[PDB]
Design an enzyme around this catalytic site. Structure first.
Site, mmCIF file in Angstrom:
data_model
loop_
_atom_site.group_PDB
_atom_site.id
_atom_site.type_symbol
_atom_site.label_atom_id
_atom_site.label_comp_id
_atom_site.label_asym_id
_atom_site.label_seq_id
_atom_site.Cartn_x
_atom_site.Cartn_y
_atom_site.Cartn_z
ATOM 1 N N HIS A 7 30.302 26.476 36.891
ATOM 2 C CA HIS A 7 31.032 27.751 36.996
ATOM 3 C C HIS A 7 31.255 28.540 35.730
ATOM 4 O O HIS A 7 31.691 29.676 35.870
ATOM 5 C CB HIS A 7 32.409 27.529 37.654
ATOM 6 C CG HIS A 7 32.375 27.076 39.092
ATOM 7 N ND1 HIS A 7 32.474 27.945 40.117
ATOM 8 C CD2 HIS A 7 32.238 25.865 39.676
ATOM 9 C CE1 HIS A 7 32.407 27.327 41.282
ATOM 10 N NE2 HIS A 7 32.261 26.057 41.035
ATOM 11 N N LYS A 33 43.726 39.601 37.090
ATOM 12 C CA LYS A 33 42.906 38.378 36.985
ATOM 13 C C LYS A 33 43.645 37.469 35.990
ATOM 14 O O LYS A 33 44.626 37.888 35.371
ATOM 15 C CB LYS A 33 41.497 38.616 36.410
ATOM 16 C CG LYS A 33 41.334 39.121 34.972
ATOM 17 C CD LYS A 33 40.706 40.498 34.895
ATOM 18 C CE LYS A 33 39.247 40.676 35.147
ATOM 19 N NZ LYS A 33 38.693 40.669 36.540
ATOM 20 N N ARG A 34 43.213 36.256 35.778
ATOM 21 C CA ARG A 34 43.877 35.396 34.815
ATOM 22 C C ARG A 34 43.788 35.996 33.401
ATOM 23 O O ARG A 34 42.756 36.618 33.067
ATOM 24 C CB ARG A 34 43.192 34.044 34.917
ATOM 25 C CG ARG A 34 44.024 32.834 34.866
ATOM 26 C CD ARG A 34 45.170 32.874 35.861
ATOM 27 N NE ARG A 34 45.544 31.500 36.143
ATOM 28 C CZ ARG A 34 45.982 30.581 35.284
ATOM 29 N NH1 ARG A 34 46.213 30.841 33.998
ATOM 30 N NH2 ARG A 34 46.241 29.385 35.770
ATOM 31 N N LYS A 92 38.362 37.842 29.106
ATOM 32 C CA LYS A 92 38.398 38.864 30.133
ATOM 33 C C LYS A 92 38.872 40.159 29.501
ATOM 34 O O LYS A 92 38.815 41.208 30.137
ATOM 35 C CB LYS A 92 39.355 38.586 31.276
ATOM 36 C CG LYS A 92 40.019 37.271 31.605
ATOM 37 C CD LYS A 92 39.146 36.376 32.424
ATOM 38 C CE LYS A 92 39.623 36.019 33.805
ATOM 39 N NZ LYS A 92 38.487 35.428 34.560
ATOM 40 N N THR A 134 34.984 37.283 41.025
ATOM 41 C CA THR A 134 34.943 37.574 42.470
ATOM 42 C C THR A 134 35.940 38.676 42.794
ATOM 43 O O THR A 134 35.742 39.409 43.753
ATOM 44 C CB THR A 134 35.194 36.278 43.263
ATOM 45 O OG1 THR A 134 36.220 35.527 42.589
ATOM 46 C CG2 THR A 134 33.912 35.463 43.422
ATOM 47 N N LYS A 143 35.906 42.053 45.488
ATOM 48 C CA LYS A 143 36.956 42.424 46.426
ATOM 49 C C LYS A 143 37.268 43.923 46.424
ATOM 50 O O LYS A 143 37.547 44.518 47.468
ATOM 51 C CB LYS A 143 38.227 41.587 46.107
ATOM 52 C CG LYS A 143 38.081 40.065 46.196
ATOM 53 C CD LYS A 143 39.240 39.274 45.572
ATOM 54 C CE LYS A 143 38.921 37.774 45.407
ATOM 55 N NZ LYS A 143 40.040 37.270 44.668
HETATM 56 C C1 PLP Z 1 39.886 36.499 43.585
HETATM 57 C C2 PLP Z 1 41.061 36.103 42.722
HETATM 58 C C3 PLP Z 1 40.843 35.628 41.441
HETATM 59 C C4 PLP Z 1 39.485 35.805 40.743
HETATM 60 O O1 PLP Z 1 39.314 37.092 40.092
HETATM 61 P P1 PLP Z 1 38.395 37.375 38.889
HETATM 62 O O2 PLP Z 1 38.599 38.753 38.587
HETATM 63 O O3 PLP Z 1 37.033 36.932 39.143
HETATM 64 O O4 PLP Z 1 38.872 36.553 37.685
HETATM 65 C C5 PLP Z 1 41.883 35.189 40.704
HETATM 66 N N1 PLP Z 1 43.143 35.236 41.204
HETATM 67 C C6 PLP Z 1 43.367 35.709 42.437
HETATM 68 C C7 PLP Z 1 44.772 35.722 42.977
HETATM 69 C C8 PLP Z 1 42.334 36.145 43.216
HETATM 70 O O5 PLP Z 1 42.603 36.542 44.522
HETATM 71 O O1 NTZ Z 2 32.817 30.577 40.662
HETATM 72 C C1 NTZ Z 2 34.174 31.066 40.809
HETATM 73 C C2 NTZ Z 2 34.709 31.616 39.466
HETATM 74 C C3 NTZ Z 2 33.742 32.573 38.673
HETATM 75 O O2 NTZ Z 2 33.579 33.793 39.366
HETATM 76 C C4 NTZ Z 2 34.303 32.925 37.288
HETATM 77 O O3 NTZ Z 2 33.472 33.947 36.758
HETATM 78 C C5 NTZ Z 2 34.348 31.715 36.362
HETATM 79 O O4 NTZ Z 2 35.114 31.992 35.175
HETATM 80 C C6 NTZ Z 2 34.859 30.532 37.198
HETATM 81 N N1 NTZ Z 2 35.235 29.312 36.659
HETATM 82 N N2 NTZ Z 2 35.618 28.549 37.767
HETATM 83 N N3 NTZ Z 2 35.477 29.290 38.938
HETATM 84 N N4 NTZ Z 2 34.988 30.542 38.598
#
Ligand code: PLP
Ligand code: NTZ
Ligand code: PLP
Ligand code: NTZ
EC number: 2.4.1.1
Lengths: 831, 831
Positions: free
Chosen positions: B366, B557-558, B563, B665, B669
């Site tokens: 990942h 996001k985190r 990021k 991801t 969304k």
């Molecule tokens: C989908 C989701 C993530 C992943 O988002 P990224 O922008 O890819 O880091 C993280 N936290 C929550 C609550 C999400 O729903």
């Molecule tokens: O595959 C799901 C997501 C990716 O979208 C992220 O880009 C990556 O930082 C990650 N590390 N662990 N899980 N993930």
């Protein structure tokens, strides 16, 4: 008929099978092809529980519309046992559920054995509280039981190599169908902290917070539609400070350390009649008290006051709306805690608050043996509960001033009555806090309440005579007759009817059948059927054979030196020795069964379990003895094993040194189930012999006077050793390894004790005990006349019902009248 | 219509109200007059759960009669979110439950907000696993999710004084209506111990035992009657040795120390893309692996083998009946564990056992950032899992011999490929164990799987090219469109129908309406309605006002340096500075909303939350700015808050340094919910821009080549500081306390880092980022043309469905064909 376990009606056997198949699918998410007996037990537990939520909801809204005085029974122990059958008995569901599961192709009996006992008690005390809750719901009382939902109750006993092995009782592993968690009603409990004395009050500041989360269990009365509540608190960490008392340690560690606050309800203390002064025990005691008092006051502030009544929160009517009963001194902090809330938070003057506190509280003392007594070291109370120590010092101050005013100049009295004991470590005497802050103090059997007045609380009785009362213990006829002995309840019900189940004095009417020939053979037939079924259970769950045609001699209770399983041991060894001496002489055959648990640290009681197994080792393998004598240790004795051994007993051992067993309740259970008693004039054995007539009992031994005479003189056990050859022979058998061959010194501690430091003077009652035991064997040989004595005992056991006890508590301590009026149906209803 | 959330039928709205009143009385033991919204939420949760136990039971017995290849998805994280609505969507219950509760007088929406999120994940990884489970059940796959039932999931974030405060997530305080505990299926897991090499085997001896107890949660596919299972293990102490490893310590202490074994499932590790080598983490990793593999093998030993098939337990067909997917290296011990059971217990020769292990296992990588990588110190594995270290050394030995045979003489290759890393502490490289013991390795977006082949696993790709694959991530259209944005799903369904919910490529058909005038105003109307409802929620649950007529600029996001929330911060400060310079010049108004959690020990991410709140402090109180610019930190970002902010966004920030975000991801969304993307050519932004056309996206920055060019050269941030006055002005504002007045040195760590040790070279993309941001403001001003680009993005998002991802996993890694065939009804049935 099966028995009179209710009707197995057409619409209702079909109702119960529908709901059983609903719960197995929808609740259990299983289908018939993967369901084990355990899933079938849960489908049933849930279907019977649906029949009492209607009555529960309407019993509780009823006490809300009519608002009676409420009785709060505070105990750190509730020994409920299993609840499926008991609930079927009280709701008259037992034959309908028997037919319904029969039609589903299942054995109800097989499923009833799957339920784990709720083991939240050590023995006598915990079980008195479960028998009390049954009788309060049966007598229409608005009563609440309050305690700690321990997640580990009393350990399961394992015997390895004759030694007790303790293992954790994970009674909740599969779930409890009967509790309803109520996390909405969580409440805060404070610990440690300090007191600021500011301007218009003292305040308790910088405390650690634990949350008390409630779990309610229903308590159905017998066939009256009352279902009262048992609420049990569980400890929960706050998610704030137990985390955000910030600044390094570790985030993960903070969350893992939550189980520090939650350890407060983790395990019952496994000690019966022994005080351990551990901080966790005191945390358990404050936590059930703090949380309960909040719930109590909360209910009172609604009542008809939080509407109007006079209009002011006049706590003056608090005693006319609230009775709180203290089961032993374990909830004694309810006295300084009810004071704290009223002075510190509700701002009543001390003296008004004190009058309201003594008028709502009442104390039951359960024993006079000194090591059972709570005497909590002041540095412990000072650290953990600093406001409450101040309140205890102020109560003391004011109480001793009343003693000084009444006994002017009697300076020893004052030091003897103080709630504060000076010495090595200062201590607070919790029993003294309880007489000072209760309007009633009672013992549990007539001689024990006389011993309180004459010895241990004599100064307190001279000061306030009107407080001391007696309320002799009882046993509930529903589990202890109808549930464990349906055949006996049947043959009784044939002759006199079914009203005796809630009116046990009606058993006196059996006296007219003491000469009825069909009754005598019937009574003898159910005892034989019980003996056969227990003899079977034994090879099934645990055995290598017994003989049902022998006298079943049983002593099942907690292992203690005062209950004297050692004197029973001396008697078994005699019997063996006599038949090794005269092999071809006939003796009446006996299966002597001794069982009970020892508290883990009680080294002598652990050594006594080991002697009993060592005797059975030798006796049960001697070929000359054959089946004339078997000795069996009855493993993991608990409520459900009692429901199986007590119907099957012929003789009950109730052999404690006069003056040490305050009442006993196992003695009562055996008397309504057809066992004859061999006992001393101790506790409630005295009122039982007075009720059946001493001719209908086997009393022996020393009376209390004789024990004190001997103690005036000085008990010397060597005098007995020297004068009784049979006794002498046994001790040198113990001392030489007759009973422990590979380890010849193994029993030297029992020998040394019996010889030099026997507190319960086992040798002084030995001669009169083996003579009394010759008399019961003589009568067992005349079956007809054994059964007519049995009949004299059963017909005379109605005094010992907990319905009689609770009705005297109600009238003479609580100020409430018992009813036996069926509450208005269950009937559905939604408002 | 309300929307097309199914039919609100006559027999079924009445069915649901009957069952809602049943559960409130019988399950909740409450009546209408004391029920709170929470009790009403539970009455509903239980009534909707009754509708899927029928389908659950028959989906599981179906896989039993037909016995397909089973897919085991092993993850230490599952970020499910709330499950009431999602379950109503998949069962077509949502409008019937809306009418039914409406008639009961309740608001379903008000009750849906009462459910606690299941927060068993940190973010991306955990949520990919929840989107995957939905798509496997929707595609008819016999799939099982396996993980740890943590009792504390990811902490709830609190901001005090602009600082993150973490507090424990007690998600189970009120209960979870959706799990079914299965204590019948508890299994033992062994720890510590030692290995005896005896005659015909090695044996793992003197181990500590922990019991793994299962809890199953149902996973309903969309409208096809398949309900698969998520099984989650909980740790339980044995009651034996955790007690009877006898001989003083203390009985009470032994029972209290049980929460030492039970700490294994107590709390999720709160780190996203960061490896902590703590022993408790490794215990969590072995425990879900050990317990899961037992359950797997148990199911296979029944199959049609435990009947006949050839007849011998020929594990040869194990890969044709079992696929186990490793979600990152966290379950990598499934490789040495499947070997141990087969060699040590089932006695297969090593090489047969190795062929069966690589053929059933598959690994998903990942991320490529080095500190995310698991490299467990050998002394840790040696102590805790000594058999497994031996198996890892033997696997290594044999794998490097294959490398030596193929690359003769290449001694650096060998040291570079080893599963054993020498150094300060030796370590095992878990990603290397996973390529050696899996038949497939895949990355999560096309550029990330190319970077794996070219850089990090280049040696492994040259050795075994056929193993490396790509499977670009997806998002489920059910929660991420239909559930969180019903209005958008409506207006789409009006024009093209409802088949797109399980066929997201059908969204291409919206391209014909890119010039349809009613569609453009509709699309613009739901975005406006979402913006209004979120703007409201905000003053309700959390606020002091925002303006719905501004551009909603969000990055949620985190919090990580890769990021780059810091680059977004530099952009907000610019905007402010420009409008302080030219106050009366018009600028397009923006509400920039940044939210996310920082792992507790990540000091820089905690400092970044503090900078964002410090900017909003200044910007949101400047009067010259007025409503032209608001900066908001979006507290406690989690799955349910994402379902509320992502429908309301106009612009999505996806701003990571090229080559660091493997896929992302959240970007997906936002693209199906009508936000336009400002991003770099990183992760899956590249396939999204390729799918919508680069004209329909705002791409900026450095590409991966340019990042590596800069690193060949040497990134010097001072060069940027020196050449860009606007950038220079901001840093001296940070450095002088413009944004932290009382604490002027407070941000010196961000300044020092950006200037001297910026790993993600925030300044190199600053010029092209503020230029790209001028372009999106220009287009926001032409509403019509913003909405036609929006339309170009939505109609082009179907590639990014997790149904497309799971169908490529199924075909190209698992060897199973997806179906979209409705399972034979729910229909009642009892066998
Ligand atoms: C989908 C989701 C993530 C992943 O988002 P990224 O922008 O890819 O880091 C993280 N936290 C929550 C609550 C999400 O729903
Ligand atoms: O595959 C799901 C997501 C990716 O979208 C992220 O880009 C990556 O930082 C990650 N590390 N662990 N899980 N993930
Ligand atoms: C009733 C009971 C007791 C009390 O018996 P005593 O003989 O009074 O000590 C103890 N344990 C169990 C299991 C009981 O049922
Ligand atoms: O009152 C119930 C029982 C009495 O019957 C016992 O005789 C006494 O030892 C005791 N101590 N605590 N509880 N109990």
């Amino acid at each position: 008929q099966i028995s009179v376990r209710g009707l197995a009606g057409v619409e209702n056997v079909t109702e119960l099978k529908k709901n059983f198949n609903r719960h197995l699918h929808f609740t259990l998410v299983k289908d018939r092809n993967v369901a084990t007996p355990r899933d079938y037990y849960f489908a049933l537990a849930h279907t019977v529980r649906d029949h009492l939520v209607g009555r529960w909801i309407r019993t509780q809204q009823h006490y809300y519309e009519k608002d009676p005085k409420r009785i709060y029974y505070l105990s750190l122990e509730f020994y409920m046992g299993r609840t499926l059958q008991n609930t079927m008995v009280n709701l008259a569901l037992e034959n309908a559920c028997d037919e319904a599961t029969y039609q589903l192709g299942l054995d109800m009996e097989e499923l009833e054995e799957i339920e784990e006992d709720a083991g939240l008690g050590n023995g006598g005390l915990g079980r008195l509280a479960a028998c009390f809750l049954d009788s309060m719901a049966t007598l229409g009382l608005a009563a609440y039981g309050y305690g700690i939902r321990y997640e580990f109750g009393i350990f399961n006993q394992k015997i390895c190599g004759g030694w007790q092995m303790e293992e954790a009782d994970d009674w909740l592993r599969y779930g409890n169908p009967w509790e309803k968690a109520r996390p909405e009603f969580t409440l805060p409990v404070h610990f440690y902290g300090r007191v600021e004395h500011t301007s218009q009050g003292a305040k308790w500041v910088d405390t650690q917070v634990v949350l008390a989360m409630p779990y309610d269990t229903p308590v159905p009365g017998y066939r009256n539609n009352v279902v009262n509540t048992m609420r049990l608190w569980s400890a929960k960490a706050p998610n704030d400070f137990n985390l955000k008392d910030f600044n390094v340690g570790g985030y993960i560690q903070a969350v893992l350390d939550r189980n520090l606050a939650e350890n407060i309800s983790r395990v019952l203390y496994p000690n019966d009649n022994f005080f351990e002064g551990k901080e966790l025990r005191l945390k358990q005691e404050y936590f059930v008290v703090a949380a309960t008092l909040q719930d109590i006051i909360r209910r009172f502030k609604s009542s008809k006051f939080g509407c109007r009544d006079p209009v002011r929160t006049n706590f003056d009517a608090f005693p006319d709306k609230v009775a709180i009963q203290l089961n032993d001194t374990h909830p004694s902090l309810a006295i300084p805690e009810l004071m704290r809330v009223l002075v510190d938070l509700e701002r009543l003057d001390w003296d008004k608050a004190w009058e309201v506190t003594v008028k709502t509280c009442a104390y039951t003392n359960h024993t006079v043996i000194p090591e059972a007594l709570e005497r909590w070291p002041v540095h412990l109370l000072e650290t953990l509960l600093p406001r409450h120590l101040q309140i205890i010092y102020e109560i003391n101050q004011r109480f001793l001033n009343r003693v000084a005013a009444a006994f002017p100049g009697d300076v020893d009295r004052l030091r003897r009555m103080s709630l504060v004991e000076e010495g090595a470590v200062k201590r607070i005497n919790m029993a003294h806090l309880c007489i000072a802050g209760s309007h009633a103090v009672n013992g549990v059997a007539r001689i024990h309440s006389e011993i309180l007045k004459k010895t241990i609380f004599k100064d307190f009785y001279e000061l306030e005579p009107h407080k001391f009362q007696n309320k002799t213990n009882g046993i509930t006829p529903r589990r202890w007759l109808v549930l464990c002995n349906p055949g006996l309840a049947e043959i009784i019900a044939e002759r006199i009817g079914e009203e005796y189940i809630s009116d046990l004095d009606q058993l006196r009417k059996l006296l007219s059948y003491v000469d009825d020939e069909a009754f005598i053979r019937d009574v003898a037939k159910v005892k034989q059927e019980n003996k056969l079924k227990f003899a079977a259970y034994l090879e099934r769950e645990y055995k290598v054979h017994i003989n049902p045609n022998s006298l079943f001699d049983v002593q099942v209770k907690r292992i203690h030196e005062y209950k004297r399983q050692l004197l029973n041991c001396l008697h078994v060894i005699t019997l063996y020795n006599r038949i090794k001496k005269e092999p071809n002489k006939f003796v009446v055959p006996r299966t002597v069964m001794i069982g009970g648990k020892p508290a883990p640290g009680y080294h002598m009681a652990k050594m006594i379990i080991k002697l009993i197994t060592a005797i059975g080792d030798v006796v049960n393998h001697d070929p000359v003895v054959g089946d004339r004598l078997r000795v069996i240790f009855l493993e993991n004795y608990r409520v459900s094993l009692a429901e199986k051994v007590i119907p099957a007993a012929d003789l009950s051992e109730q052999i404690s040194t006069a003056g040490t067993e305050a009442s006993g309740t196992g003695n009562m259970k055996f008397m309504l189930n057809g066992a004859l008693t061999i006992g001393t004039m101790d506790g409630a054995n005295v009122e039982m012999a007075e009720e059946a007539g001493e001719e209908n009992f086997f009393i022996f031994g020393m009376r209390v006077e004789d024990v004190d005479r001997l103690d005036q003189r000085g008990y010397n056990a060597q005098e007995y050793y020297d004068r009784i050859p049979e006794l002498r022979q046994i001790i040198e058998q113990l001392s030489s390894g007759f009973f422990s061959p590979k380890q010849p010194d193994l029993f030297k501690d029992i020998v040394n004790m019996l010889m030099h430091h026997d507190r319960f003077k086992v040798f002084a009652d030995y001669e009169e005990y083996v003579k009394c035991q010759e008399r019961v064997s003589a009568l067992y040989k005349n079956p007809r006349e054994w059964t007519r004595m049995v009949i004299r005992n059963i017909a005379t056991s109605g005094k010992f019902s907990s319905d009689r006890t609770i009705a005297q508590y109600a009238r003479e301590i609580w100020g409430v009248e018992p009813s036996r009026q069926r509450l208005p149906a269950p009937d559905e209803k939604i408002p």
